[PDB]
Amino acid sequence: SVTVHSSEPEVRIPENNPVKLSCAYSGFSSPRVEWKFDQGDTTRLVCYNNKITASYEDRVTFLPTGITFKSVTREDTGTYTCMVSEEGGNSYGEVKVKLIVL
Amino acid sequence: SVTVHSSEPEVRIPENNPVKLSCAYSGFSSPRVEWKFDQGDTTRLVCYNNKITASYEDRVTFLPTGITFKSVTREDTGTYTCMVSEEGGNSYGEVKVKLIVL
Amino acid sequence: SVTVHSSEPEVRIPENNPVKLSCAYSGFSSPRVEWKFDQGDTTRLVCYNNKITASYEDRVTFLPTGITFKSVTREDTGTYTCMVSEEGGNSYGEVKVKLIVL
Amino acid sequence: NLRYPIADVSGGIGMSPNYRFRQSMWIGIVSYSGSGLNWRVQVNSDIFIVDDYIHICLPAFDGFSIADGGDLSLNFVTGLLPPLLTGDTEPAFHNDVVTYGAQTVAIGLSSGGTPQYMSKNLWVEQWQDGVLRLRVEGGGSITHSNSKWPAMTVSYPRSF
Amino acid sequence: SPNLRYPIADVSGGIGMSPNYRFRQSMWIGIVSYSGSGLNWRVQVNSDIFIVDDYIHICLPAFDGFSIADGGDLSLNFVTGLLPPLLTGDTEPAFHNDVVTYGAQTVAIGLSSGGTPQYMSKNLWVEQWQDGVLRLRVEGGGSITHSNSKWPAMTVSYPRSF
Amino acid sequence: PNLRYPIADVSGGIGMSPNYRFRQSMWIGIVSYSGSGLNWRVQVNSDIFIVDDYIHICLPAFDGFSIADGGDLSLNFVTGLLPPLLTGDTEPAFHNDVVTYGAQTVAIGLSSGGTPQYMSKNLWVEQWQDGVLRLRVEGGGSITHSNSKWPAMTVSYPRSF
């Protein structure tokens, strides 16, 4: 049984400031972390395979404990879902973090 | 090598009775068993990969020591061949059982 | 880490005589040796996978220390390149020998 | 303490060559069907098992009328050369219906004549009781009595 | 076993090969989108997905579309439509996001203006995968004027990232 | 040590060598058509991927001249491969036997300068000998022409080990 939860299930930070969404996971050996941004009707890929996508590469860095932004904007207010799958897909974890930019 | 023989190389059982065709094999670790029915000049698949086929699933069960019928009819009189191949195909065994429905 | 060099980096032998181009390698466990003949612009395969090709099989034998000719002619003057790759291609060695049939 | 495909390779723990490359042959019957049209052809094809895949190299062959939508069936119940078993041609997805390996394949159609080639769609549809059924449809059609088929190689994950 | 690294794992006691590595079946119900020479349109589709060893196969069913240019891009959006446990990241090629011409194959497409379809033999291949969106190049085979296009079932494969 | 490739040491534990799983390279060599007296060659740049026990050669699209109904397309791997690739690495598992492996349909445009007409032809890996892979290319049907446009084709087959 693997564990994947978040310490800060709901962040609220002022515009143009740095912020880290923490996804702390345990119980994996060969895990693949993946984050997806959610702004209502649209989903966007932020990070996949412990690697940040191109559309974000310039202002979001990865870490096994969460992704952190160089600076945020209202544009990024939404529900970020962090998914951690093991190798083989027999171990799966997931947790959503809610971001609110001001 | 490996051994694949039969204790009952020839069965003779009255219609509508259950009957088991015994194929006893030894010398395999990851074997795949397969049976083929033979009535004259038409070959039919009974069991493959230690799994009974669809056309027989409803009245024939599998066992590492042979397949057994819920009930037989003259329709099934013929030469059933049991083949046991190892994984990789370096070990191969085979024996024929003749069924006669009285 | 692996070593592939030659003791006789330039051979000079009279026509119709036997000659051995030596390629001494060390550092490999499951190596695949390969020789290529070079006459200006035309490249030809001499040996591949510790096995002499067809077009040469009748007058060139293989050896872990180099290929030897039954008899040579000026047709064979050129730069013979010996390549030694490991299994997986992580270990690669190479050395060229220049033959001059006088 | 080694379970195939992991096995002993020259003293050390390696990979069984039978897993990597296994070559065979099938000399059986390919049978077309659909819209009442039926016919069969005996054929000689090579069979390669590489890793978890199985490849059936069907050579080119001639046939008769074919409907717009039809099924081509290879009967593996017979024709396989020892030590191959019909059960060795079972897909990893067992007998579910799929649309695996969908590919385009040109067939020449003639009335005895000068063949006119149709680009048709073909794929592994379903394997049941040793009989592999490929769906062959699309590409439009014309009236004909003869059909020329190309060499086709059919592949798919193999059951273990 | 503690000292075993996938795909090598514990099978029936012995050191064996993980079945999840050998065969892993899934599905995608997403959006395929054509584009090129100003022509744009999308289609919702249901395709099976098989992962065999180090390859990944996407069995696209046949589907219908609109006008298409001589040279175009067909994009599968894997950001959504995948079946748990599958992750969009799992659809990433071994050659990551470089541009390639992998799996080049011929594929016939029927083009019509409502009436009877005329089939074109076009060239298609895996071009590049970026941010969960697989883009296949589809060009060649000449063209004619049309408003509708019928596509065949196509299976797309390529080395999968690990 | 006690491990035989493709089984190797992966971060302390017994794993699978990544070189076995994915190995990428390139070939910049000569493809040569032939058959019915027609002869011509073309220099090309193709990627090469080795995945597991397979080898894929991604031939880009290219232009050529006249072609017979039945012909042979030969990739000369004796040269053009990029280190550490060896011509011997291109040898099929079935060594140099003659086969009909990877048979596929491939459309080729034929023209006489002007507009191209595409033929659906049959192509497959026929035989590999002395570093030269020969693919058979026949059927379709055909017609008069002086130029031929080829599509990007990926050729695959079990690789020798």
PDB file of N, CA and C in Angstrom, chain D residues 6 9-15 17 19-21 23 46 48-55 57-60 103-106 115-119 149-153 155, chain F residues 1-8 14 16 20 51-54 93-95 97-106 120-124 138-141 158-161:
ATOM      1  N   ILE D   6      13.668 -15.472 -18.346  1.00  0.00           N
ATOM      2  CA  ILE D   6      14.943 -15.337 -17.672  1.00  0.00           C
ATOM      3  C   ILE D   6      15.446 -16.738 -17.476  1.00  0.00           C
ATOM      4  N   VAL D   9      22.263 -18.369 -19.124  1.00  0.00           N
ATOM      5  CA  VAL D   9      22.971 -18.236 -20.396  1.00  0.00           C
ATOM      6  C   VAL D   9      24.471 -18.305 -20.123  1.00  0.00           C
ATOM      7  N   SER D  10      25.077 -19.441 -20.479  1.00  0.00           N
ATOM      8  CA  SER D  10      26.505 -19.701 -20.273  1.00  0.00           C
ATOM      9  C   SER D  10      26.954 -19.342 -18.847  1.00  0.00           C
ATOM     10  N   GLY D  11      26.410 -20.089 -17.887  1.00  0.00           N
ATOM     11  CA  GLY D  11      26.737 -19.892 -16.483  1.00  0.00           C
ATOM     12  C   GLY D  11      26.024 -18.746 -15.788  1.00  0.00           C
ATOM     13  N   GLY D  12      25.969 -17.596 -16.449  1.00  0.00           N
ATOM     14  CA  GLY D  12      25.322 -16.445 -15.848  1.00  0.00           C
ATOM     15  C   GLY D  12      23.842 -16.295 -16.125  1.00  0.00           C
ATOM     16  N   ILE D  13      23.234 -15.348 -15.421  1.00  0.00           N
ATOM     17  CA  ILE D  13      21.817 -15.074 -15.586  1.00  0.00           C
ATOM     18  C   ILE D  13      21.634 -14.238 -16.852  1.00  0.00           C
ATOM     19  N   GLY D  14      21.015 -14.830 -17.867  1.00  0.00           N
ATOM     20  CA  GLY D  14      20.801 -14.110 -19.106  1.00  0.00           C
ATOM     21  C   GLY D  14      19.371 -14.220 -19.580  1.00  0.00           C
ATOM     22  N   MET D  15      19.188 -14.013 -20.879  1.00  0.00           N
ATOM     23  CA  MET D  15      17.869 -14.089 -21.480  1.00  0.00           C
ATOM     24  C   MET D  15      17.792 -15.258 -22.468  1.00  0.00           C
ATOM     25  N   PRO D  17      17.405 -17.430 -25.474  1.00  0.00           N
ATOM     26  CA  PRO D  17      17.389 -17.163 -26.917  1.00  0.00           C
ATOM     27  C   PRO D  17      16.063 -17.570 -27.578  1.00  0.00           C
ATOM     28  N   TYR D  19      13.300 -17.006 -26.471  1.00  0.00           N
ATOM     29  CA  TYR D  19      12.410 -15.883 -26.194  1.00  0.00           C
ATOM     30  C   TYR D  19      12.679 -14.787 -27.208  1.00  0.00           C
ATOM     31  N   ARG D  20      13.966 -14.600 -27.489  1.00  0.00           N
ATOM     32  CA  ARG D  20      14.419 -13.575 -28.420  1.00  0.00           C
ATOM     33  C   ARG D  20      14.126 -13.908 -29.875  1.00  0.00           C
ATOM     34  N   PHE D  21      14.473 -15.115 -30.320  1.00  0.00           N
ATOM     35  CA  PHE D  21      14.180 -15.522 -31.694  1.00  0.00           C
ATOM     36  C   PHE D  21      13.788 -16.990 -31.769  1.00  0.00           C
ATOM     37  N   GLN D  23      11.988 -19.386 -34.781  1.00  0.00           N
ATOM     38  CA  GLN D  23      11.431 -19.431 -36.131  1.00  0.00           C
ATOM     39  C   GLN D  23      10.681 -20.710 -36.466  1.00  0.00           C
ATOM     40  N   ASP D  46       6.082 -18.311 -43.314  1.00  0.00           N
ATOM     41  CA  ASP D  46       7.072 -18.397 -42.257  1.00  0.00           C
ATOM     42  C   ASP D  46       6.462 -17.816 -41.001  1.00  0.00           C
ATOM     43  N   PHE D  48       7.693 -16.127 -37.233  1.00  0.00           N
ATOM     44  CA  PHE D  48       8.766 -15.659 -36.350  1.00  0.00           C
ATOM     45  C   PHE D  48       8.201 -15.181 -35.033  1.00  0.00           C
ATOM     46  N   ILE D  49       8.835 -15.607 -33.948  1.00  0.00           N
ATOM     47  CA  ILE D  49       8.415 -15.159 -32.635  1.00  0.00           C
ATOM     48  C   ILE D  49       9.600 -14.413 -32.098  1.00  0.00           C
ATOM     49  N   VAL D  50       9.424 -13.110 -31.941  1.00  0.00           N
ATOM     50  CA  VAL D  50      10.479 -12.259 -31.435  1.00  0.00           C
ATOM     51  C   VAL D  50       9.967 -11.616 -30.162  1.00  0.00           C
ATOM     52  N   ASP D  51      10.593 -11.946 -29.040  1.00  0.00           N
ATOM     53  CA  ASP D  51      10.161 -11.378 -27.787  1.00  0.00           C
ATOM     54  C   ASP D  51       8.713 -11.792 -27.537  1.00  0.00           C
ATOM     55  N   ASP D  52       7.855 -10.808 -27.276  1.00  0.00           N
ATOM     56  CA  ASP D  52       6.456 -11.083 -26.996  1.00  0.00           C
ATOM     57  C   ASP D  52       5.565 -10.877 -28.195  1.00  0.00           C
ATOM     58  N   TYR D  53       6.173 -10.875 -29.374  1.00  0.00           N
ATOM     59  CA  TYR D  53       5.428 -10.712 -30.613  1.00  0.00           C
ATOM     60  C   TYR D  53       5.493 -11.976 -31.435  1.00  0.00           C
ATOM     61  N   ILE D  54       4.518 -12.122 -32.315  1.00  0.00           N
ATOM     62  CA  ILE D  54       4.506 -13.252 -33.215  1.00  0.00           C
ATOM     63  C   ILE D  54       4.186 -12.678 -34.580  1.00  0.00           C
ATOM     64  N   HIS D  55       4.985 -13.083 -35.562  1.00  0.00           N
ATOM     65  CA  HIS D  55       4.838 -12.581 -36.913  1.00  0.00           C
ATOM     66  C   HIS D  55       4.530 -13.711 -37.847  1.00  0.00           C
ATOM     67  N   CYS D  57       4.325 -14.404 -41.707  1.00  0.00           N
ATOM     68  CA  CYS D  57       4.630 -13.865 -43.018  1.00  0.00           C
ATOM     69  C   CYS D  57       3.883 -14.572 -44.136  1.00  0.00           C
ATOM     70  N   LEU D  58       2.675 -14.101 -44.411  1.00  0.00           N
ATOM     71  CA  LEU D  58       1.868 -14.681 -45.466  1.00  0.00           C
ATOM     72  C   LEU D  58       2.441 -14.306 -46.813  1.00  0.00           C
ATOM     73  N   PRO D  59       2.636 -15.288 -47.684  1.00  0.00           N
ATOM     74  CA  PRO D  59       3.181 -14.941 -48.984  1.00  0.00           C
ATOM     75  C   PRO D  59       2.019 -14.448 -49.839  1.00  0.00           C
ATOM     76  N   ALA D  60       2.315 -13.946 -51.027  1.00  0.00           N
ATOM     77  CA  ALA D  60       1.248 -13.470 -51.888  1.00  0.00           C
ATOM     78  C   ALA D  60       0.437 -14.675 -52.380  1.00  0.00           C
ATOM     79  N   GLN D 103      -3.665  -1.903 -40.942  1.00  0.00           N
ATOM     80  CA  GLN D 103      -2.746  -1.480 -41.989  1.00  0.00           C
ATOM     81  C   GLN D 103      -3.443  -1.401 -43.344  1.00  0.00           C
ATOM     82  N   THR D 104      -2.812  -0.721 -44.297  1.00  0.00           N
ATOM     83  CA  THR D 104      -3.382  -0.613 -45.629  1.00  0.00           C
ATOM     84  C   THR D 104      -2.729  -1.658 -46.514  1.00  0.00           C
ATOM     85  N   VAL D 105      -3.545  -2.333 -47.319  1.00  0.00           N
ATOM     86  CA  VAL D 105      -3.048  -3.388 -48.191  1.00  0.00           C
ATOM     87  C   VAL D 105      -3.791  -3.372 -49.533  1.00  0.00           C
ATOM     88  N   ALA D 106      -3.021  -3.310 -50.622  1.00  0.00           N
ATOM     89  CA  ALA D 106      -3.554  -3.249 -51.983  1.00  0.00           C
ATOM     90  C   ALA D 106      -3.826  -4.622 -52.582  1.00  0.00           C
ATOM     91  N   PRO D 115      -5.678  -6.560 -63.893  1.00  0.00           N
ATOM     92  CA  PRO D 115      -5.952  -6.283 -62.509  1.00  0.00           C
ATOM     93  C   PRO D 115      -6.001  -4.811 -62.194  1.00  0.00           C
ATOM     94  N   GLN D 116      -7.008  -4.425 -61.427  1.00  0.00           N
ATOM     95  CA  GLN D 116      -7.140  -3.049 -60.984  1.00  0.00           C
ATOM     96  C   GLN D 116      -6.985  -3.120 -59.469  1.00  0.00           C
ATOM     97  N   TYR D 117      -5.997  -2.415 -58.928  1.00  0.00           N
ATOM     98  CA  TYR D 117      -5.727  -2.470 -57.504  1.00  0.00           C
ATOM     99  C   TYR D 117      -6.503  -1.556 -56.558  1.00  0.00           C
ATOM    100  N   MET D 118      -7.038  -2.165 -55.502  1.00  0.00           N
ATOM    101  CA  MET D 118      -7.811  -1.461 -54.484  1.00  0.00           C
ATOM    102  C   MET D 118      -7.023  -1.378 -53.187  1.00  0.00           C
ATOM    103  N   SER D 119      -7.034  -0.202 -52.571  1.00  0.00           N
ATOM    104  CA  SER D 119      -6.344  -0.022 -51.307  1.00  0.00           C
ATOM    105  C   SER D 119      -7.371  -0.351 -50.236  1.00  0.00           C
ATOM    106  N   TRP D 149      -3.706 -11.220 -54.075  1.00  0.00           N
ATOM    107  CA  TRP D 149      -3.298 -10.673 -52.789  1.00  0.00           C
ATOM    108  C   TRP D 149      -1.808 -10.559 -52.656  1.00  0.00           C
ATOM    109  N   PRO D 150      -1.359  -9.537 -51.924  1.00  0.00           N
ATOM    110  CA  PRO D 150       0.068  -9.310 -51.707  1.00  0.00           C
ATOM    111  C   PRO D 150       0.585 -10.106 -50.522  1.00  0.00           C
ATOM    112  N   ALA D 151       1.900 -10.100 -50.368  1.00  0.00           N
ATOM    113  CA  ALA D 151       2.512 -10.794 -49.254  1.00  0.00           C
ATOM    114  C   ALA D 151       2.222  -9.862 -48.098  1.00  0.00           C
ATOM    115  N   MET D 152       1.710 -10.411 -47.015  1.00  0.00           N
ATOM    116  CA  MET D 152       1.413  -9.585 -45.872  1.00  0.00           C
ATOM    117  C   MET D 152       1.980 -10.246 -44.643  1.00  0.00           C
ATOM    118  N   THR D 153       2.505  -9.436 -43.737  1.00  0.00           N
ATOM    119  CA  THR D 153       3.021  -9.982 -42.507  1.00  0.00           C
ATOM    120  C   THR D 153       2.062  -9.494 -41.450  1.00  0.00           C
ATOM    121  N   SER D 155       1.176  -9.336 -37.401  1.00  0.00           N
ATOM    122  CA  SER D 155       1.823  -9.398 -36.092  1.00  0.00           C
ATOM    123  C   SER D 155       0.852  -9.042 -34.991  1.00  0.00           C
TER     124      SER D 155
ATOM    125  N   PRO F   1      29.603 -10.261 -14.863  1.00  0.00           N
ATOM    126  CA  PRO F   1      30.069 -11.035 -13.675  1.00  0.00           C
ATOM    127  C   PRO F   1      29.244 -12.346 -13.630  1.00  0.00           C
ATOM    128  N   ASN F   2      28.136 -12.384 -12.872  1.00  0.00           N
ATOM    129  CA  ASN F   2      27.305 -13.575 -12.957  1.00  0.00           C
ATOM    130  C   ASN F   2      26.066 -13.184 -13.833  1.00  0.00           C
ATOM    131  N   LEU F   3      26.118 -12.008 -14.480  1.00  0.00           N
ATOM    132  CA  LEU F   3      25.015 -11.537 -15.331  1.00  0.00           C
ATOM    133  C   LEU F   3      25.355 -11.406 -16.802  1.00  0.00           C
ATOM    134  N   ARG F   4      24.566 -12.084 -17.638  1.00  0.00           N
ATOM    135  CA  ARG F   4      24.753 -12.052 -19.087  1.00  0.00           C
ATOM    136  C   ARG F   4      23.743 -11.139 -19.775  1.00  0.00           C
ATOM    137  N   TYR F   5      24.250 -10.150 -20.510  1.00  0.00           N
ATOM    138  CA  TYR F   5      23.416  -9.211 -21.231  1.00  0.00           C
ATOM    139  C   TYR F   5      22.362  -9.977 -22.056  1.00  0.00           C
ATOM    140  N   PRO F   6      21.129  -9.429 -22.164  1.00  0.00           N
ATOM    141  CA  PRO F   6      20.700  -8.068 -21.817  1.00  0.00           C
ATOM    142  C   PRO F   6      20.408  -7.912 -20.301  1.00  0.00           C
ATOM    143  N   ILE F   7      20.640  -8.960 -19.520  1.00  0.00           N
ATOM    144  CA  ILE F   7      20.431  -8.849 -18.085  1.00  0.00           C
ATOM    145  C   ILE F   7      21.701  -8.234 -17.542  1.00  0.00           C
ATOM    146  N   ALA F   8      21.519  -7.160 -16.782  1.00  0.00           N
ATOM    147  CA  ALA F   8      22.638  -6.450 -16.181  1.00  0.00           C
ATOM    148  C   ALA F   8      22.292  -5.784 -14.845  1.00  0.00           C
ATOM    149  N   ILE F  14      19.388  -6.250  -9.945  1.00  0.00           N
ATOM    150  CA  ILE F  14      19.407  -6.985 -11.211  1.00  0.00           C
ATOM    151  C   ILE F  14      18.309  -6.401 -12.083  1.00  0.00           C
ATOM    152  N   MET F  16      17.403  -4.658 -16.358  1.00  0.00           N
ATOM    153  CA  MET F  16      17.561  -4.845 -17.789  1.00  0.00           C
ATOM    154  C   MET F  16      18.352  -3.692 -18.402  1.00  0.00           C
ATOM    155  N   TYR F  20      19.737  -2.291 -24.366  1.00  0.00           N
ATOM    156  CA  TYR F  20      18.959  -3.359 -24.980  1.00  0.00           C
ATOM    157  C   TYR F  20      17.565  -2.826 -25.294  1.00  0.00           C
ATOM    158  N   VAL F  51      15.215  -1.422 -30.633  1.00  0.00           N
ATOM    159  CA  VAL F  51      14.352  -1.576 -29.477  1.00  0.00           C
ATOM    160  C   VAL F  51      14.245  -3.071 -29.206  1.00  0.00           C
ATOM    161  N   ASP F  52      14.754  -3.514 -28.057  1.00  0.00           N
ATOM    162  CA  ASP F  52      14.724  -4.925 -27.708  1.00  0.00           C
ATOM    163  C   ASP F  52      15.494  -5.708 -28.763  1.00  0.00           C
ATOM    164  N   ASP F  53      14.838  -6.721 -29.323  1.00  0.00           N
ATOM    165  CA  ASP F  53      15.456  -7.556 -30.336  1.00  0.00           C
ATOM    166  C   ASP F  53      15.086  -7.148 -31.762  1.00  0.00           C
ATOM    167  N   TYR F  54      14.601  -5.926 -31.922  1.00  0.00           N
ATOM    168  CA  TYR F  54      14.231  -5.431 -33.233  1.00  0.00           C
ATOM    169  C   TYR F  54      15.148  -4.304 -33.618  1.00  0.00           C
ATOM    170  N   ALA F  93      18.101 -11.762 -37.218  1.00  0.00           N
ATOM    171  CA  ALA F  93      18.185 -12.934 -36.348  1.00  0.00           C
ATOM    172  C   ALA F  93      18.241 -14.176 -37.212  1.00  0.00           C
ATOM    173  N   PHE F  94      17.543 -14.124 -38.343  1.00  0.00           N
ATOM    174  CA  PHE F  94      17.511 -15.242 -39.281  1.00  0.00           C
ATOM    175  C   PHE F  94      18.677 -15.116 -40.257  1.00  0.00           C
ATOM    176  N   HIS F  95      19.762 -14.530 -39.754  1.00  0.00           N
ATOM    177  CA  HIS F  95      20.999 -14.318 -40.495  1.00  0.00           C
ATOM    178  C   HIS F  95      20.797 -13.904 -41.951  1.00  0.00           C
ATOM    179  N   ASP F  97      19.258 -15.889 -44.470  1.00  0.00           N
ATOM    180  CA  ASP F  97      18.315 -16.712 -45.209  1.00  0.00           C
ATOM    181  C   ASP F  97      17.421 -15.764 -46.001  1.00  0.00           C
ATOM    182  N   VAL F  98      16.742 -16.289 -47.013  1.00  0.00           N
ATOM    183  CA  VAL F  98      15.847 -15.468 -47.813  1.00  0.00           C
ATOM    184  C   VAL F  98      14.479 -15.555 -47.158  1.00  0.00           C
ATOM    185  N   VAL F  99      13.850 -14.401 -46.948  1.00  0.00           N
ATOM    186  CA  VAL F  99      12.542 -14.365 -46.306  1.00  0.00           C
ATOM    187  C   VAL F  99      11.539 -13.484 -47.032  1.00  0.00           C
ATOM    188  N   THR F 100      10.421 -13.238 -46.365  1.00  0.00           N
ATOM    189  CA  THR F 100       9.352 -12.394 -46.880  1.00  0.00           C
ATOM    190  C   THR F 100       8.841 -11.679 -45.632  1.00  0.00           C
ATOM    191  N   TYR F 101       9.793 -11.276 -44.792  1.00  0.00           N
ATOM    192  CA  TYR F 101       9.501 -10.618 -43.527  1.00  0.00           C
ATOM    193  C   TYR F 101       9.104  -9.173 -43.698  1.00  0.00           C
ATOM    194  N   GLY F 102       8.221  -8.722 -42.811  1.00  0.00           N
ATOM    195  CA  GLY F 102       7.749  -7.349 -42.813  1.00  0.00           C
ATOM    196  C   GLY F 102       7.054  -6.871 -44.074  1.00  0.00           C
ATOM    197  N   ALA F 103       6.433  -7.789 -44.810  1.00  0.00           N
ATOM    198  CA  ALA F 103       5.725  -7.444 -46.046  1.00  0.00           C
ATOM    199  C   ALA F 103       4.717  -6.340 -45.766  1.00  0.00           C
ATOM    200  N   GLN F 104       4.770  -5.273 -46.554  1.00  0.00           N
ATOM    201  CA  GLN F 104       3.870  -4.136 -46.372  1.00  0.00           C
ATOM    202  C   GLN F 104       3.556  -3.466 -47.705  1.00  0.00           C
ATOM    203  N   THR F 105       2.509  -2.651 -47.716  1.00  0.00           N
ATOM    204  CA  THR F 105       2.122  -1.939 -48.919  1.00  0.00           C
ATOM    205  C   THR F 105       2.711  -0.561 -48.863  1.00  0.00           C
ATOM    206  N   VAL F 106       3.245  -0.114 -49.987  1.00  0.00           N
ATOM    207  CA  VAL F 106       3.871   1.196 -50.055  1.00  0.00           C
ATOM    208  C   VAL F 106       3.616   1.861 -51.420  1.00  0.00           C
ATOM    209  N   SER F 120       0.393   1.372 -55.820  1.00  0.00           N
ATOM    210  CA  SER F 120       0.447   0.675 -54.545  1.00  0.00           C
ATOM    211  C   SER F 120       1.314  -0.547 -54.779  1.00  0.00           C
ATOM    212  N   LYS F 121       2.536  -0.539 -54.263  1.00  0.00           N
ATOM    213  CA  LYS F 121       3.423  -1.675 -54.442  1.00  0.00           C
ATOM    214  C   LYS F 121       3.671  -2.459 -53.162  1.00  0.00           C
ATOM    215  N   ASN F 122       4.085  -3.704 -53.328  1.00  0.00           N
ATOM    216  CA  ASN F 122       4.350  -4.600 -52.221  1.00  0.00           C
ATOM    217  C   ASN F 122       5.852  -4.629 -51.958  1.00  0.00           C
ATOM    218  N   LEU F 123       6.243  -4.448 -50.701  1.00  0.00           N
ATOM    219  CA  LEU F 123       7.656  -4.449 -50.319  1.00  0.00           C
ATOM    220  C   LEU F 123       7.920  -5.234 -49.030  1.00  0.00           C
ATOM    221  N   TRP F 124       9.073  -5.903 -48.944  1.00  0.00           N
ATOM    222  CA  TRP F 124       9.407  -6.669 -47.738  1.00  0.00           C
ATOM    223  C   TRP F 124      10.897  -6.936 -47.632  1.00  0.00           C
ATOM    224  N   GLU F 138       7.815  -5.276 -55.484  1.00  0.00           N
ATOM    225  CA  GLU F 138       7.086  -5.673 -56.688  1.00  0.00           C
ATOM    226  C   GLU F 138       5.584  -5.511 -56.604  1.00  0.00           C
ATOM    227  N   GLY F 139       4.912  -5.742 -57.730  1.00  0.00           N
ATOM    228  CA  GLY F 139       3.468  -5.600 -57.803  1.00  0.00           C
ATOM    229  C   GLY F 139       3.042  -4.162 -58.042  1.00  0.00           C
ATOM    230  N   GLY F 140       1.731  -3.948 -58.090  1.00  0.00           N
ATOM    231  CA  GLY F 140       1.175  -2.553 -58.060  1.00  0.00           C
ATOM    232  C   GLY F 140       0.106  -2.457 -59.146  1.00  0.00           C
ATOM    233  N   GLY F 141       0.665  -1.786 -60.117  1.00  0.00           N
ATOM    234  CA  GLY F 141       0.902  -2.549 -61.325  1.00  0.00           C
ATOM    235  C   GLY F 141       1.929  -1.532 -61.732  1.00  0.00           C
ATOM    236  N   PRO F 158      13.736  -8.763 -36.834  1.00  0.00           N
ATOM    237  CA  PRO F 158      14.465  -9.322 -35.694  1.00  0.00           C
ATOM    238  C   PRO F 158      15.936  -9.073 -35.919  1.00  0.00           C
ATOM    239  N   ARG F 159      16.630  -8.678 -34.874  1.00  0.00           N
ATOM    240  CA  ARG F 159      18.037  -8.416 -35.023  1.00  0.00           C
ATOM    241  C   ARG F 159      18.881  -9.541 -34.432  1.00  0.00           C
ATOM    242  N   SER F 160      19.999  -9.810 -35.089  1.00  0.00           N
ATOM    243  CA  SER F 160      20.913 -10.854 -34.664  1.00  0.00           C
ATOM    244  C   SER F 160      21.580 -10.529 -33.344  1.00  0.00           C
ATOM    245  N   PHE F 161      21.848 -11.545 -32.531  1.00  0.00           N
ATOM    246  CA  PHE F 161      22.506 -11.343 -31.240  1.00  0.00           C
ATOM    247  C   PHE F 161      23.527 -12.434 -30.926  1.00  0.00           C
TER     248      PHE F 161
END
